[PDB]
Structures are given as structure tokens and as C-alpha cells.
Design a protein around this ligand. Structure first.
Ligand SMILES: *[C@@H]1O[C@H](CO)[C@@H](O)[C@H](O)[C@H]1NC(C)=O
Ligand SMILES: *[C@@H]1O[C@H](CO)[C@@H](O)[C@H](O)[C@H]1NC(C)=O
Ligand SMILES: *[C@@H]1O[C@H](CO)[C@@H](O)[C@H](O)[C@H]1NC(C)=O
Ligand SMILES: *[C@@H]1O[C@H](CO)[C@@H](O)[C@H](O)[C@H]1NC(C)=O
Ligand SMILES: *[C@@H]1O[C@H](CO)[C@@H](O)[C@H](O)[C@H]1NC(C)=O
Ligand SMILES: *[C@@H]1O[C@H](CO)[C@@H](O)[C@H](O)[C@H]1NC(C)=O
Ligand SMILES: *[C@@H]1O[C@H](CO)[C@@H](O)[C@H](O)[C@H]1NC(C)=O
Ligand SMILES: *[C@@H]1O[C@H](CO)[C@@H](O)[C@H](O)[C@H]1NC(C)=O
Ligand SMILES: *[C@@H]1O[C@H](CO)[C@@H](O)[C@H](O)[C@H]1NC(C)=O
Ligand SMILES: *[C@@H]1O[C@H](CO)[C@@H](O)[C@H](O)[C@H]1NC(C)=O
Ligand SMILES: *[C@@H]1O[C@H](CO)[C@@H](O)[C@H](O)[C@H]1NC(C)=O
Lengths: 420, 50, 88, 198
């Protein structure tokens, strides 16, 4: 079939019609970003010849190639260490969560580390780590930071974000109630704080339900963590190809160098060893080139993760479609195998009604423009909502300002302005 | 077959006609002694980085 | 260690910053009669925010700080003629 | 050691050039590494066999150098794009992105030239000298909730004031910095206090 781009919606546009939402839903999304690869080192002398000496003497005639490959791999390893050091270590003091957990009604017990495990990870991090689960010259070097240290970094960031807001990434972390923090973050998207201070219970219930749904999705569906499994699969396939390249002959009589050194003489064995040397060197150079090209994209993803850790968790961002689909409120970092998983809490308006609107209103010959609001009507009376939440207020001289006469503005409507 | 590595008794289920043994990397990790009907595991010699 | 066998350093039961990266959570430093010591790197101090439902901290003063951020912009433009490198 | 990022690029380029030069001291399986010797000691029919190996070796080395140079120029271009975005968003205007142009509240950045690079002097606003204060979401004067307009309700222990969120400036709670919205039995944490009407 021919793929469809979506539904066919038709916005009922008009010069005197506006839609103001009356309710809201607290959505929690999930964005996964690869942060680091597997640190691998390749001894070219052991991969090209293997415990041999004549082949090593024949390979020394090719110049400084093994040194170049080792330097490239060491640079890749240092880059992978920098990629995870510049993402999870954006905090100086490891913060701790208070024993009494009274955050207004928001349940963080399923996102905070549990004492059940040896103070290592949380339920979501355990699911993430359980969902993405000595050679012929190849070796895998362990990363600098361990899973426990990355998890402690994420827990410190979470505790700071919960108990201080955005005041721990711009100086000294100062305490603030979570309700007032949520009110101040609602005051950054356009909604006032009186909406939160009256629907705090519904907001906490929606947040808990969204976290539960995220947990259920992570438990049931295992195909979500695809960007982290793809890197592991690509690295494993690259290593498997580099290993299987040791079985090719490249024109020689045998792939094993021992079978050549035990069948031919040094006068005639050099011609058969040079083919294998050239083939294995070309294979290793191709592997190193592909590894550098992949590390470039991994570094790009790690920089994107550092950006989504700086101005997304340690502060509220106004960048549309950068920290969740909708008006960003707060993001929570979670540790993942070779990556990071953000939990973007976004404000999503819903249940919108159709009202009629005007640019200004004329009372005594002069025009009245709203300070911060939009003139709406229920059919017969004029009110003003804020920007996104229908809160009809009486039009007074305290929420409007006069600017000129009402003979130049297109859409003016006669109405009474209340004077207190 | 000439090389180097530690030799140890293996618990593999070799068949009366199988003489050698290769892993997923096409590397000989098991052989049969040409005199005694015993299968020996060929593990590579110790090595690493410095 | 989880990364190998370190022969020449003494394992101390303290925690400092990371000077020379070794492996999984292991760092080395030349500190005190001087010798190389191996230890588990520390992520930072263990601070504890006095969080409650009815307390807030508001800063009374401020400090203007000027930091530096160094970013590379370009490299040395080089040109290599093949007829002078492979031949000549 | 401060100008380390700028020196690392120069060191990498110098090492690449030195390796490319030293790759001419190799025979790649031939009898010598100098074409003059091969051409002055061998006949053309027999010298091409020795010249082809040197040609292949030098071509492979040059291709590896060009590939590494392209890979490095990619990262240099990424860093240059980042520096241009920083110059456009913190020198030609104030930025609100956290930890993008320094630690703290960004105020202004100053560009400074550097060899093959740029150094930004990020002037930031770092609060200090914190102090604990008890707080409430709003107050009840005459059965109505008085939510603040831009600030936070603080108390020194006995009296309630209204101050900023980044600097302690206590002011009397009047009906010019607070707005009334709703009753006073729906908000959890509210504290009874008087509101001054000028
Ligand atoms: C808003 O939506 C929630 C469900 O998400 C519902 O429980 C609540 O009653 C709605 N409130 C309004 C104002 O309709
Ligand atoms: C939070 O949710 C967990 C179940 O996920 C529950 O056991 C715990 O009691 C809840 N805590 C609160 C604050 O109700
Ligand atoms: C409009 O609102 C006013 C005040 O709430 C009310 O008296 C009037 O009946 C409403 N009219 C309609 C059409 O809803
Ligand atoms: C709004 O549009 C309608 C339909 O085109 C038109 O009749 C009316 O005059 C317009 N009013 C304004 C504000 O110009
Ligand atoms: C508003 O009132 C003026 C006279 O006060 C009148 O001339 C004008 O036509 C009226 N406009 C509307 C929207 O009816
Ligand atoms: C070889 O001879 C030895 C000594 O007599 C005996 O122990 C062994 O079983 C023989 N092996 C084979 C393969 O015949
Ligand atoms: C703020 O600090 C300056 C010096 O850094 C000091 O002179 C001033 O008195 C301090 N402000 C207060 C309110 O103490
Ligand atoms: C606030 O209270 C906590 C706990 O008593 C204390 O550690 C902190 O120093 C206080 N902050 C100030 C500067 O008042
Ligand atoms: C609180 O502030 C008021 C007005 O500045 C002052 O009169 C009172 O003594 C202060 N009380 C305390 C506990 O500091
Ligand atoms: C604040 O927390 C304390 C201790 O749990 C509790 O006694 C008090 O009622 C709480 N106040 C409100 C209204 O949140
Ligand atoms: C506020 O005043 C009302 C009426 O006097 C009273 O019922 C309520 O307990 C008071 N609350 C506080 C915070 O003292």
C-alpha cells in the first residue's frame, strides 16, 4: 500500500474565533541517546602474524602503521571516556535525597535508588540494564567510570533537581518545596501558579500514572532501547568480521602462518606471507577507519546528550521539540548501558473550546489592549484567559492598557471596562 | 598442527571419527592425541597489554 | 584490579580526585618518602540539602565570575602533491 | 596547560605530517627506499617490479593520511560551528541556555582571538550567601488566596514578606505584587496573613 502521512485535519480558522484549552495532561516521554562505545585495543603484531618472528621482520618493512592504528584506537578510547565524563559529571557535590519523602504528592520512589539492591540503581535503571544485555589479538578495555559511579551521578542529579530545582547547576544548591518549584516551572510556559496550587492533586496523580505507564512500557516492550543495542550490534559485527578475516588466504596457499612456515623455506615463504600481511593490514585499516567514522557520530550523540543534560535537567528549556513533545516542565536522567535515558515531563493542553475573540475593546473612545491575556466570550459577556488555560476574569483596568483611539485597530468591539 | 598454548583435558563430546575441533572463530581449540584416544583442549598461551 | 594487575603502587583506603586513569574506578597519583598510590576515585563531596515542605533558601549576595571557554576553529591548511611524494 | 585544546590539534597535525614523512624511509618489500638507487642500480625492465611496491606503499600511506585528515577536519568543523553558535548567541545577545556559556546565569561574553581558535570570556551571575526562610504558596487575608505575581513569600520568623527568587529583597505584602484567584480552602500549605491595601 501507499503509506499515509496522517489524518486529514481542518482547523476552523476565522478572524473572530480562538480556541482556549480548559484542561491539561502531564505527559512523560522517553528519549534514549548513545553516549559511549566499547573501548577496544588491537595489537597488530599479534593479529597479523601471531607469536611469529619472520613475519614480524617482514612487517617491520611497512613503516609506522601499527603505531598509527594503536594511536587511533587509544584516541578513540580517550574520546569514549571523555564522552561519558562530560555527560554524567555536570555536578560537583553528590547530593542526597532526604529521608522523609514529602514532595507534595509526587512519587519518586520508583525513579530514586532503592536500598534493596546494594545502593546501586533504581527500578527503571534495573529494567534498562536488564533489557540491553582474550582473543587472537583483540581486547576490550573497561571504561573509567563504572555502572555504580554513573548511577550515583544520576542519583545526585535527580536529588538536586528534586530538592533545589535549577539552582544546583548555576551556583549553590538552595532548598525549595517541590510544589513551589512546579509552580515556578509552570510560570515559565505561560500558565499561572494558581492553576497548580489548585490542581496539585490531579497533577501528582497524572505524573504517577505516567511514570507507571513508562515502567509498564519498559517491562513489556523490549524494542524501545534500539539506539543502544544498534551500537553494540555494530561493534560486535565489526569484531566478528575482523576475526573472520584471519581465515582468508588473499592468494596464499594457507591462512595459517604456521602451516606455511612448516611447509616452505624462507626463500619461498616470504612470497606467501606478504599476501597475508597485506590482506590483514588492509582489513585492520578498514576496521580502524570504520571505528573512527562511528566514533564521530557517537561523539556527536554524546554532545547532544550533554546539551540535553545541561539545559534540560539543570534548567527549564523554551526550545520547542527539544525536551519532549509539548511545553517542557522538567526532565529526569536515568542511567543506561552505554547511554542515557531522559524522562521529559511536558505540559500538554487538552479539552479546548471554541470562543470568539477581538484584538482590543473600546470603552470611552480609547482602545484597551490586554497586558497578558486574550479577550474571549461565552456568547454574550467578554472575559480574558491567560494564554492556554481558560480562566475567565472580568475586564478591569488592571489587566489592560490604553493605547490610542479605536479607529485604527481592525477588529475592535464595544465593551465596558471595569474600574475598581 | 604446530603452534603454542596450554594443553588441558577437555570434557567435549568428540565422536569416534572427529580428530580436531574449531570454535566460532575457526580456531583449533581441541585435538585428539595420535597415540592415546584422549581429547586435549588447546587454550591460547597467556598474553596481554603492558 | 578490574582492569588488570598494577605492580608498583600501594592501594590506599582513601578517596581523592582522578589524576591518572587506570581502569574501572581506579586512579593513580604521586602523593606521600614519595610513592605512587592507587585508589577508588571519588565523584565529589556528600552534600545533603535540608529539604522540607515549608523552607526555602534565598541568596542575599552575589558574585560576578568571568570564565574562559577555548574552542578550536581551524587547522593548518596543507597540500600534498602525489607526484612529489609517491614519485619525484 | 590552559590552551590545551588548541595545542592538541597542532600536535596531531605535526604527528601526522611526521609519520607521512617517515613513511618514505620504508622499502615495503623492495631492495631500497630511494627511487634513485633502484633506477641507478637496475634496468627499466627489472626496476619496475621494485618501483611498484614503493608506489603501492606510498599510495596507501597517503590515502590513510587523507582519510585521517578528513576525519579530523570533520571534528574541527563541528567545533567551529559550535564556536559560531556561541559567538552568535552569547556575544551578540544574552542567552538563557543553562551551562552553554558558563556556569551560572549568563550576562555577557567577550570574544578573544587565539591561534587557530577562539576564547570566550563568559561573565556569569553566581548567587552566594544563602539564608533559610520559611515559605507559603499564598496567604489568606479575607477568605481569599493571594498568590504572588513575581516572587516568593518568605518570613523571618514573625513577619511575612515578598522577595525575589534570585536576590533577597524583603518587601511588605501589598495588593500590587499579588493577585487574587480562588478561595482559601483548596490550596495545601497556605498561611494566614494580612495584605496591605495602599
Ligand atoms: C481534567 O482531566 C482529568 C483527567 O486527566 C479529569 O480527571 C479532570 O476532571 C479534568 N478536569 C476538568 C477541568 O475537566
Ligand atoms: C509510590 O509507589 C510505590 C509503588 O510503585 C508504592 O509502593 C509507594 O507506597 C508509593 N509511595 C507513595 C508516596 O505513595
Ligand atoms: C456568560 O457568562 C455570564 C457570567 O458568568 C453569565 O451570566 C451568562 O449567562 C453567560 N452566557 C452564556 C451564553 O453562557
Ligand atoms: C471577518 O470575516 C468575515 C467573513 O469573511 C467578514 O464578513 C467580516 O467582515 C470580517 N471581519 C473583520 C474583523 O474584518
Ligand atoms: C461602537 O460605538 C460607536 C459609538 O459609541 C459606534 O459608532 C460604533 O459603530 C460601535 N461599533 C460597534 C462594534 O458596534
Ligand atoms: C601406542 O603404544 C602405547 C605403548 O604400547 C600404547 O600405550 C598406546 O595405546 C598405543 N596407541 C595407539 C594409538 O596405538
Ligand atoms: C555582599 O558582599 C560584599 C563583599 O563581597 C559586602 O561588602 C556586602 O556587605 C555583602 N552584602 C551584605 C548584605 O552583607
Ligand atoms: C539551613 O538549614 C540547614 C539545616 O539546619 C543548615 O545546614 C544550613 O546551613 C542553613 N542555611 C543557612 C545558611 O541558613
Ligand atoms: C522580622 O522583621 C520585622 C520587620 O523588619 C522585624 O521588626 C522583626 O523583629 C523581625 N523578626 C525577626 C524574628 O527577626
Ligand atoms: C509539612 O510536613 C510536616 C512533617 O511531615 C507536616 O507535619 C506538615 O503538616 C506538613 N505541612 C503541609 C501542609 O504540607
Ligand atoms: C486561618 O484562619 C481560619 C479562620 O480563622 C482558621 O480556621 C484557620 O485555622 C487559620 N489557619 C491558620 C494557618 O492559622
Amino acid at each position: 500500500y501507499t503509506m499515509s502521512l496522517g489524518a486529514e485535519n481542518s482547523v476552523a480558522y476565522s478572524n473572530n474565533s480562538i480556541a482556549i484549552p480548559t484542561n491539561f495532561t502531564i505527559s512523560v516521554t522517553t528519549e534514549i541517546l548513545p553516549v559511549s562505545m566499547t573501548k577496544t585495543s588491537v595489537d597488530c603484531t599479534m593479529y597479523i602474524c601471531g607469536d611469529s618472528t619472520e613475519c614480524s621482520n617482514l612487517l617491520l618493512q611497512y613503516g609506522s602503521f601499527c603505531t598509527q592504528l594503536n594511536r587511533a584506537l587509544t584516541g578513540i578510547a580517550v574520546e569514549q571516556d571523555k564522552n561519558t565524563q562530560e555527560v554524567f559529571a555536570q555536578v560537583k557535590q553528590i547530593y542526597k535525597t532526604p529521608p522523609i519523602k514529602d514532595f507534595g504528592g509526587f512519587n519518586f520512589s520508583q525513579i530514586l535508588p532503592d536500598p534493596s539492591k546494594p545502593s546501586k540503581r533504581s527500578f527503571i535503571e534495573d529494567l534498562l540494564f536488564n533489557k540491553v544485555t582474550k582473543f587472537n589479538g583483540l581486547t576490550v578495555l573497561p571504561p573509567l567510570l563504572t555502572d555504580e559511579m554513573i548511577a550515583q551521578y544520576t542519583s545526585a542529579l535527580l536529588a538536586g533537581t528534586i530538592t533545589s530545582g535549577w539552582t544546583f547547576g548555576a551556583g549553590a544548591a538552595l532548598q525549595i518545596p517541590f510544589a513551589m518549584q512546579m509552580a515556578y516551572r509552570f510560570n515559565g510556559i505561560g500558565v499561572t501558579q494558581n492553576v497548580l496550587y489548585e490542581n496539585q492533586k490531579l497533577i501528582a496523580n497524572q505524573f504517577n500514572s505516567a511514570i507507571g505507564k513508562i515502567q509498564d512500557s519498559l517491562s513489556s516492550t523490549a524494542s524501545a532501547l534500539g539506539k543502544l543495542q544498534d551500537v553494540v550490534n555494530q561493534n560486535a559485527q565489526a569484531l566478528n568480521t575482523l576475526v573472520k578475516q584471519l581465515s582468508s588466504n588473499f592468494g596464499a596457499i594457507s591462512s595459517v602462518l604456521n602451516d606455511i612456515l612448516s611447509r616452505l623455506d624462507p626463500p619461498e615463504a616470504e612470497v606467501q606471507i606478504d599476501r597475508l600481511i597485506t590482506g590483514r593490514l588492509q582489513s585492520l585499516q578498514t576496521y580502524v577507519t570504520q571505528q573512527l567514522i562511528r566514533a564521530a557520530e557517537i561523539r556527536a550523540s554524546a554532545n547532544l546528550a550533554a546539551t540535553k543534560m545541561s539545559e534540560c535537567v539543570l534548567g527549564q528549556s523554551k526550545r520547542v521539540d527539544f525536551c519532549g513533545k509539548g511545553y517542557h516542565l522538567m526532565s529526569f536522567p536515568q542511567s543506561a548501558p552505554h547511554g542515557v535515558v531522559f524522562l521529559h515531563v511536558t505540559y500538554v493542553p487538552a479539552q479546548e473550546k471554541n470562543f470568539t475573540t477581538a484584538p482590543a475593546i473600546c470603552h470611552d473612545g480609547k482602545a484597551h489592549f490586554p497586558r497578558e491575556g486574550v479577550f474571549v466570550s461565552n456568547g454574550t459577556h467578554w472575559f480574558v484567559t491567560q494564554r492556554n488555560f481558560y480562566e475567565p476574569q472580568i475586564i478591569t483596568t488592571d489587566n489592560t492598557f490604553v493605547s490610542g483611539n479605536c479607529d485604527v485597530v481592525i477588529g475592535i468591539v464595544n465593551n465596558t471596562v471595569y474600574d475598581p | 598442527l604446530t603452534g603454542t598454548g596450554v594443553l588441558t583435558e577437555s570434557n567435549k563430546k568428540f565422536l569416534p571419527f572427529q580428530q580436531f575441533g574449531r570454535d566460532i572463530a575457526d580456531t583449533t581449540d581441541a585435538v585428539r592425541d595420535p597415540q592415546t584416544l584422549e581429547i586435549l583442549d588447546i587454550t591460547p598461551c597467556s598474553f596481554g597489554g603492558v | 584490579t578490574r582492569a588488570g594487575c598494577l605492580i608498583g603502587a600501594e592501594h590506599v583506603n582513601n578517596s581523592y580526585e582522578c589524576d591518572i586513569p587506570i581502569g574501572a574506578g581506579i586512579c593513580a597519583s604521586y602523593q606521600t618518602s614519595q610513592s605512587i598510590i592507587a585508589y577508588t576515585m571519588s565523584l565529589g563531596a556528600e552534600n545533603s540539602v535540608a529539604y522540607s515542605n515549608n523552607s526555602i533558601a534565598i541568596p542575599t549576595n552575589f558574585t560576578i565570575s568571568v570564565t574562559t571557554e577555548i574552542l578550536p576553529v581551524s587547522m593548518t591548511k596543507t597540500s600534498v602533491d602525489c607526484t612529489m611524494y609517491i614519485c619525484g
